[PDB]
Design a protein around this ligand. Sequence first.
Ligand SMILES: COc1ccc2sc(N)nc2c1
Lengths: 412, 412
Amino acid sequence: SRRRVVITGMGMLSPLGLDVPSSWEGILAGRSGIAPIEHMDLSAYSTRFGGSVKGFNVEEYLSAKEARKLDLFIQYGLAASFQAVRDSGLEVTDANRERIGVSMGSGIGGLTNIENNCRSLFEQGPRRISPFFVPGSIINMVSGFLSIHLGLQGPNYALTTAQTTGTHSIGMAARNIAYGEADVMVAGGSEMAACGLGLGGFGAARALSTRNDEPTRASRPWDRDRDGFVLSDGSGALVLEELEHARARGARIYAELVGFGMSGDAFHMTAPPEDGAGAARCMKNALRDAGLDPRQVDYINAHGTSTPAGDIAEIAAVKSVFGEHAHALSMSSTKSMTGHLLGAAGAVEAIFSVLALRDQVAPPTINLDNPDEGCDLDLVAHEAKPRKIDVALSNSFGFGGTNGTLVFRRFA
Amino acid sequence: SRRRVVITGMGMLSPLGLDVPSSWEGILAGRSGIAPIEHMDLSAYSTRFGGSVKGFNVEEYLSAKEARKLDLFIQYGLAASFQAVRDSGLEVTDANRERIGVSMGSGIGGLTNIENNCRSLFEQGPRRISPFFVPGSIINMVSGFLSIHLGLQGPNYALTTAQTTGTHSIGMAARNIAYGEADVMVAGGSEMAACGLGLGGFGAARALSTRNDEPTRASRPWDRDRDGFVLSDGSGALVLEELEHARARGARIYAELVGFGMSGDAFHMTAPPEDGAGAARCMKNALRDAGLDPRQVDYINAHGTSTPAGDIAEIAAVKSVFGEHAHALSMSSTKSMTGHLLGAAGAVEAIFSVLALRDQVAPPTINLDNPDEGCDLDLVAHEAKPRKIDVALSNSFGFGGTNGTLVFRRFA
Ligand SMILES: COc1ccc2sc(N)nc2c1
């Protein structure tokens, strides 16, 4: 058999706020974190808006000197991680530090740092490149720096599965604990790809909403007028903990992580299949892993990116998995408010899933003014819906047809 | 309940060969694959050589139409993945495609591609960024593209743990199979960091050998005259397979993967501890994971990067784990010949470890002219050593203090 895993701490930076409760408050009020991107010339760019972290103060976490060495994505991952560990009340000791690990990932990593060091290289040649360029930019440095700052000697790694990173990070952290390689893991993701290369790179694939006139309306998952996703920055981190370890120290337990599913579509590099066959296999994998019948699922935090093919695949996938229960469950995209945090999306959305369980409320899908063809499910258009939620799914479906599903259950 | 895991297929691009057998012939003959770099102008750089993949034809594997969209690290990962799957004899079918996944990782990923697109952005503006910039550069796309081309619908993911990537990728793919999430995994990693930011960034950190006038003598693990690692390019992939599934199809089994350890130093962003304490914990985790008396270990394929601190920390780690038996086992660094393939280091070296078992030979550490203070173990100086090898261990350490160990033994 296998050990049970609970959530005892959460941390977040999002376009809605600099912590979980500020973020969760924006989510339940249907507020948008989307705005024109500042202190950056986007003249030559078809998309000029996104979900920025507003007012981030890294010196609450790090000295100026240590922050100068670290890409914004690492800073964001450290901020959420430190919030999550503080939130958990866990005490690291010589007795337990070998049993505490980290799996904080990113989809794209240090584009901003790569951009500024490129500028240096092209203008002045190699000797102006920072000595901290490599360790200040590579995706495993959130796990590296967190482990060094807190003395964590457990499993130390980083996932990078594009828009699935946060979901896979949390799921595989849960496995480490369940199968006895760790008693505690800090897991989630962080992203800051709102530089030229991010807006440029996604802009050149014409993957992005170009609704520059109304940035807050850009992200409209399942609405007939959606025109691609909104690029957003931030981080989410969860403290995952074995149940007996959490009980022994009197931890506050938000919820239980009961299920993790993975699948590959094996279909296309960036587009999901129209029937969502891959997202369906993955959800079924996640429910089987949790020993749950589809009928027991109450709430789904959808991937719901506001891409035309993505949104419609997820409706197909849900009807396929859930049959006669597909309308009774509530499903919303919090990306309607946050935008797409890419590798961080699954981290912040796992937190919103855990808070849907705590507060017995489905977050809205805002901007769902005119449901598309077949988009007839309970998508919680416009405003939050209080309701019974015992079981909550969080889905992530990313580039390369990589799929993740987390199952959370109320704990008592 | 935990199932056993065997190697049925291996694939490789290295500075010594465009497959495994050609690479292996170089290893046993003590050949260096390090040379001045030709693919760019390095006169302004303090290091001007590396382990380049020579004569790679991507059209053994892909259309030039698909290949053009992909960074070399992805092309290298696919080439190794395809070799390994072919070498396995496995046929993908409707009956098994859900039970075959992929975990191919990278340390840095598509730095070449991100650089070239950055140069386009800076000189010409955002509209010259390739529409293929994101799917062609991000680390999960070896796993993505391989799943699309072979129809693998199993667990689909990528690790990025700097120089530990290949070892972690292989270990956690083995856990997927061990605990029933999959019957087959294609696991390893790929790296092509030999661009301006790579050589520039590692140069700025003073991490690289500057032995430009004798590049084949640069990589000299445990030698008193070593001055940093040699940057090398390539890929390794193994087909990992549940033992009964391998037996059932009459698969040729190269060796059994019995053991996997992880640990974090929690010491420094880039420097290993002088005493090898984190490496020691990681190897001890792996030996206990395999149910082994440490005296059963015959061969260690060291990380052995040719850094002053790295190499000495490893001797200390091995003496501490193995006590007097440290004097009886054979340890070598094939990085003496291949240089440091970073994220792909653990993948190729896991293959060298398996081939060490098949042929009953310890590969040499070339250039070990004057062993340093305390480097007094059997380091297989100069020349391959035929010897009894039942159990082989492959170590990796990386930035963030992240450690991986793999334990293989002969299968009967
Ligand atoms: C069922 O899949 C599993 C089980 C155990 C483990 S330990 C790890 N690192 N990943 C996994 C995945």
